[PDB]
Design a protein around this ligand. Structure first.
Ligand SMILES: *[C@@H]1O[C@H](CO[C@@H]2O[C@@H](C)[C@@H](O)[C@@H](O)[C@@H]2O)[C@@H](O[C@@H]2O[C@H](CO)[C@@H](O)[C@H](O)[C@H]2NC(C)=O)[C@H](O)[C@H]1NC(C)=O
Ligand SMILES: *[C@@H]1O[C@H](CO)[C@@H](O)[C@H](O)[C@H]1NC(C)=O
Ligand SMILES: *[C@@H]1O[C@H](CO)[C@@H](O)[C@H](O)[C@H]1NC(C)=O
Lengths: 592, 420
């Protein structure tokens, strides 16, 4: 029974390899490569949008703490849901069908999030866009693998990973080109405002639409048809592959010699179909945890979890520590003025990063002044007058106000810390957020540059891994990149400036990419064609969950010590490499 | 039914009851110019009002019922000096037995003491951190009814607030002599205003208390925010009762221009003392006589007047064009000699058709005596524009609840102390 099923599966796997070797590698494979590359570039773009628009969205939507933290994790949660969902559905509906559905969902919700004015609605739309894009990598890799012969399968699959780098470069370039134009204030509705970061969100939603447009013109994988008992469709698709390949070669006269292909024998109503689909998907997921695949599944789970944890933790740790170093440098330059006596003067100014202490101001007019990180402490204002006062990161602590008037000022109730007001008057208060929202200026530029350097050191690793995956092997590439990543994690200690951390980020990003490439190719090659997308989507959902955990843990360690992140990343990567070294070798095997 | 009732007369304070209680007025007791019947007491020893009764009306019985009523105006408490500073304002205690009325920070207290030194207190507390208060620096009708068998009750504006059983006290021997003077206040700039002080020898029920409150309210005369008489040729800030968080403003001058309600209001704050809303915001509304036959400057009921809007220290005229689209007519501020035949006469209303006293209402009328409607506000594309509409008249005829047709006039007062 089961042995007969395994025998027929092996016979189909060998015949499919023979047919694919007959068809050859050429124009069809490269066209599908570029189509799925657009699908993967959308995935690469998706993970930068919220990180790039948080500084502007915080002021434009009054985002407090624990609201910018859940927005920075919502894409990963949506991705964790979507990867599992679409990977499970791909083995019952098809790779191309589920890819179309997921890409359309991502595009729709990314367009709709560009016009949402609230926060919770923006959070929901961004979560659903993450759900739509979560199924890109599993389906794309398991769809491209079923058109490749065994001769060069590691290299052809590894060349598919350049598109995440391309998407990251595209996102960084568009953020640099669009967001810095803060003057754009397009008005459609009195209560609604349309700034530049929404245009950035639209431009970042574009590649998913291009991916849908390109994918609509591709055929379903023949192996999916063969598994489900549809023989004529699979034969037609294989004939199309052969015809396109031969026409590209320059010999459009030979005939597809395959006549019959072995196929796997198959043994209100909307709710019935839904229940059947759920049952079949659960059966596939459970069979992934079967007696035949239980060791492979567990080692894959360990490798994916550990590598995702380390990579995402360090990748979010580098910019946070750069920001912390900049903040320390900024606080080291603060000016202190102890003791002042000002009287009878209209005295305006624009001071930044200052602390006035022990001041005494009597009948002073403060007309039109900009305050940035200016703090008044132990001061006394008597018969003063504040007009056209703009405030940012400005506080009044241990201050006393007597007969003072705040006319046309943004000095809200949260800027007076343990102060005492007597006979004070607040008139024509400016519109603003109820709480402090901070402000980012020129530094955003540098942030984009840093991103362009974090996704460009990846390119040498991608090239080397793509060229060498078949020559050394998947296992050795994975192990030799994980070990080097652990060594770089050890090297992390010798960095205390912004330039050093930019260099360290570039090094780590350029080192771990080969490991990620090798893991993708391995998890593609290690599963049968009737469970490939289910298992790969489950592992990618685990990757996203580990990403959330690692981001939280490594962000909690910023500014405390360098020992905890280094130890966590090195331990996780060492365990991942140890678990990876026990994996079976898949090089030089038919795509079983 | 009244034993003591202090009223004003020709340059003296008299008692309307048939007892002739002797009244002695100190050399620093003041009176208002327009409502000289109301009396003011300051924080000085010479600020004394003294009333002496007869021996036949002295409260010295066993089960004798009694009640008192008056109108009290107390300014805002500005600093922390006024906290925990209960000071007596009305005194009738001899040999540590009798009744007293005192004030504390946001409290009116009624105390009674027997010959056994028992204390029974009834307190009305009003908050001072409210945006717009009904009791801060505004006239309050306070009446206390004591039932020696069951309990003692406080009433403000005809409504019951607190009540406490007084069965424990056995005998009260109040003084033959009653004192009106601040006593025990450490603030040197503290004063009160009292008027219409009446005594009764029976516990008044809710019906009689409401009757007295309405009889003494002078419903035929309009009242401003503080509860005083409304006066011609006096600048008033405008407050809309249905929407009390925005103030009347203008943007342009002319028929094209309009007036609206701009918000939110500011705030006057003394930390942990008061967090009130600013009342001196907006444009002032002066009222000018048009056909008033009375010689005084007091605005009475059913008076046809002109309204001037003070914009940039310049006076204008409130008028509309009757012939326009919609039921509501948009209010506008025009030049006084450039009003032409635009509808500008306003009938000032203080009570309803049945005679029930309500707030101030303005009824815009044309030269033919036709009711354009009651002045209120209506929202045009998220802008609360001042209009005159007959919809309010329709609701009044149907005994419904109108929305936006009630107004308050806020002049500058010393008891509020807001900087303008
Ligand atoms: C707070 O102000 C009140 C009212 O004064 C008004 O507001 C001031 C800010 C200023 O603009 C004054 O010119 C205003 O008249 C003060 O109470 C009154 O103060 C004046 C002295 O300016 C005094 O003559 C009055 O008797 C005071 N009235 C009362 C009822 O006490 C108050 O003193 C101010 N607070 C403090 C702490 O001084
Ligand atoms: C404000 O300060 C500037 C100098 O920085 C001065 O030129 C200007 O006159 C000041 N404003 C007023 C109203 O005096
Ligand atoms: C500042 O110090 C304390 C509050 O921490 C306070 O007691 C002190 O009075 C303040 N200084 C002045 C000048 O008010």
């Amino acid at each position: 029974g089961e042995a007969q099923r395994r025998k027929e599966r092996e016979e189909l796997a060998q015949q499919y390899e023979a047919i694919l070797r007959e068809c050859g590698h050429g124009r069809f494979q490269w066209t599908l490569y570029f189509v799925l590359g657009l699908a993967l570039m959308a995935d690469g773009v998706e993970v930068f949008v919220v990180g790039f628009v948080l500084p502007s969205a915080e002021k434009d939507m009054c985002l407090s703490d624990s609201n910018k933290g859940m927005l920075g994790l919502i894409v990963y949660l949506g991705m964790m849901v979507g990867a599992f969902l679409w990977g499970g559905l791909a083995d019952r509906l098809g790779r191309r069908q589920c890819l179309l559905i997921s890409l359309s969902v991502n595009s729709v919700f990314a367009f709709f999030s560009s016009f949402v004015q609230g926060y919770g609605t923006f959070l929901f739309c961004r979560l659903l866009s993450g759900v739509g894009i979560g199924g890109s990598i599993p389906i794309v890799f398991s769809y491209f693998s079923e058109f490749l012969a065994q001769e060069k399968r590691g290299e052809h699959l590894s060349w598919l990973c350049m598109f995440w780098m391309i998407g990251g470069v595209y996102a960084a370039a568009m953020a640099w080109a669009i967001i810095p134009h803060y003057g754009w204030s397009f008005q459609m509705g009195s209560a609604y405002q349309f700034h530049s970061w929404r245009v950035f969100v639209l431009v970042c939603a574009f590649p998913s639409v291009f991916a849908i447009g390109a994918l609509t013109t591709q055929p379903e994988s023949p192996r999916f048809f063969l598994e489900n008992g549809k023989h004529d469709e699979a034969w037609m698709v294989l004939k199309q592959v052969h015809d396109t390949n031969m026409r590209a070669k320059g010999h459009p006269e030979r005939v597809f010699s395959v006549t019959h292909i072995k196929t796997i024998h198959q043994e209100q109503r909307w709710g019935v179909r839904a229940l059947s689909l759920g049952g079949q998907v659960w059966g596939n997921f459970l069979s992934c945890f079967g007696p035949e695949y239980r060791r492979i599944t567990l080692m894959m789970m360990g490798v994916w979890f550990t590598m995702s944890f380390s990579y995402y933790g360090l990748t979010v740790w580098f910019p946070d520590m750069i920001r912390h170093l900049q903040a320390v440098d900024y606080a080291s330059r603060t000016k202190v003025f102890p003791g002042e006596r000002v009287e009878h003067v209209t005295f305006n100014f624009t001071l930044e990063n200052q602390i006035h202490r022990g001041g005494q101001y009597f009948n002073d007019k403060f007309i039109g002044l900009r305050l940035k990180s200016v703090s008044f402490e132990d001061s006394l204002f008597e018969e003063c007058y504040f007009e056209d006062v703009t405030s940012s990161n400005t506080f009044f602590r241990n201050c006393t106000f007597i007969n003072t008037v705040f006319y046309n000022t943004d000095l809200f109730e949260y800027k007076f810390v343990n102060s005492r007001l007597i006979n004070s008057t607040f008139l024509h208060n400016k519109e603003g957020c109820p709480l402090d929202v901070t402000g980012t200026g020129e530094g955003a530029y540098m942030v984009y540059f840093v991103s362009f350097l974090g996704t460009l050191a990846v390119l040498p690793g991608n090239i080397v891994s793509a060229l060498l995956m078949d020559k050394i092997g998947r296992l050795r590439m994975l192990a030799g990149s994980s070990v080097m990543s652990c060594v770089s994690c050890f090297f992390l200690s010798f960095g205390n400036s912004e330039s050093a951390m930019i260099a360290l980020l570039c090094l780590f990003g350029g080192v771990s990419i080969a490991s990620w490439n090798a893991l993708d190719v391995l998890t593609v090659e290690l599963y049968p064609s009737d469970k490939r997308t289910t298992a790969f989507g489950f592992l990618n959902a685990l990757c996203k969950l580990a990403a959330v955990l690692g981001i939280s843990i490594f962000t909690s360690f910023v500014g405390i010590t360098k020992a905890a992140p280094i130890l966590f990343a090195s331990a996780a990567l060492a365990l991942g490499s140890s678990l990876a070294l026990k994996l079976p070798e898949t090089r030089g095997q038919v795509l079983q | 039914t009244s034993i003591l009732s202090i009223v004003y007369k020709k340059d003296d304070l008299i008692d309307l009851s048939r007892y002739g209680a002797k009244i002695n007025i100190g050399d620093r007791v003041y009176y208002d110019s327009i409502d000289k019947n109301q009396i003011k007491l300051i924080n000085l020893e010479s600020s004394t009002i003294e009333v002496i009764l007869k021996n036949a009306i002295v409260y010295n019985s066993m089960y004798e019922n009694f009640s008192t009523s008056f109108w009290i105006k107390i300014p805002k408490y500005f600093s922390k000096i006024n906290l925990n500073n209960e000071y007596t304002i009305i005194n009738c205690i001899e040999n540590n037995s009798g009744w007293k009325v005192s004030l504390n920070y946001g409290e009116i207290i009624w105390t009674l003491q027997d010959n056994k030194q028992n204390i029974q207190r009834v307190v009305f507390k009003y908050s001072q951190m409210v945006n717009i208060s009904d009791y801060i620096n505004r006239w309050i009708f306070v009446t206390i009814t004591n039932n020696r068998l069951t309990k003692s009750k406080i009433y403000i504006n005809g409504r019951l607030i607190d009540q406490k059983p007084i069965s424990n006290l056995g005998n009260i021997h109040a003084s033959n002599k009653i004192m009106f003077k601040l006593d025990g206040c450490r603030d040197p700039r503290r004063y009160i205003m009292i008027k219409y002080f009446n005594l009764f020898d029976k516990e008044l029920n809710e019906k009689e208390i409401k009757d007295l409150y309405d009889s003494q309210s002078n419903s035929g005369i309009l009242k401003d925010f503080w509860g005083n008489y409304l006066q011609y040729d006096k600048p008033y800030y405008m407050l809309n009762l249905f929407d009390p968080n925005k103030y009347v403003d203008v943007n342009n001058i002319g028929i094209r221009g309009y007036m609206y309600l701009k918000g939110p209001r500011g705030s006057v704050v003394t930390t942990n003392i008061y967090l009130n809303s600013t009342l001196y915001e907006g444009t002032k509304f002066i009222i000018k006589k048009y056909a008033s036959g009375n010689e005084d400057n007091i605005v009475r009921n059913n008076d046809r007047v002109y309204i001037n809007v003070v914009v940039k220290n310049k006076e204008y005229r409130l008028a509309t064009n009757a012939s326009q689209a919609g039921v509501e007519k948009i209010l506008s501020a025009l030049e006084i000699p450039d009003v032409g035949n635009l509808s500008q006469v306003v009938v000032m209303k203080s009570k309803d058709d049945q005679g029930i006293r309500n707030k101030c209402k303005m009824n815009l009328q044309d030269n033919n005596g036709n009711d354009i409607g009651f002045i209120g506000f209506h929202l045009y594309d998220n802008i609360a524009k001042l209009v005159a509409s007959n919809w309010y008249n329709r609701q009044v005829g149907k005994a419904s609840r109108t929305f936006g047709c009630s107004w308050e006039f806020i002049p500058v007062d010393d008891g509020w102390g807001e900087s303008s």
